[PDB]
Design a protein around this ligand. Structure first.
Ligand SMILES: [Cl-]
Ligand SMILES: [Cl-]
Ligand SMILES: [Cl-]
Ligand SMILES: [Cl-]
Ligand SMILES: [Cl-]
Ligand code: NA
Length: 129
């Protein structure tokens, strides 16, 4: 599923991401835009052989099991395919674990390089939230 900007903002808010660990909702929407272009089915292969999955491009090296990343962990205790669903619940729950682990949203390269330090509230401007 390809979300609209405000549709995704409202879904993320219902799932508890607004100000989760101090990150306002615009941060999450900006990260989703640049990681996946709001597409829950996005996948991208990394040079080390791991793969990133879903709307927040969660990586199989640490966070989910895809059966083809030898020596990886599965800290969200989910198959990576669960992260491609039109229902973002699995992605959100896993992201909450990721952002809690110490590095905050710096875990998302696109967030660091394209959202951090910008006016992220613009990403939820106009939405009925
Ligand atoms: Cl915001
Ligand atoms: Cl772009
Ligand atoms: Cl594996
Ligand atoms: Cl933080
Ligand atoms: Cl940009
Ligand atoms: Na894994």
């Amino acid at each position: 599923k390809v979300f609209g900007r405000c549709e995704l903002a409202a879904a993320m808010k219902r799932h508890g991401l607004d100000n989760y660990r101090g990150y306002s909702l615009g941060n999450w929407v900006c990260a989703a835009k640049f990681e996946s272009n709001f597409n829950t089915q996005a996948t991208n292969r990394n040079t080390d052989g791991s793969t990133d999955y879903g709307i927040l491009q969660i990586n199989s090296r640490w966070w989910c099991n895809d059966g083809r990343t030898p020596g990886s962990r599965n800290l969200c205790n989910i198959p990576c395919s669960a992260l491609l669903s039109s229902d973002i619940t699995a992605s959100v729950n896993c992201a909450k674990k990721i952002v809690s682990d110490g590095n905050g949203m710096n875990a998302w390269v696109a967030w660091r390089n394209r959202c951090k330090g910008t006016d992220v509230q613009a990403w939820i401007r106009g939405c009925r939230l």
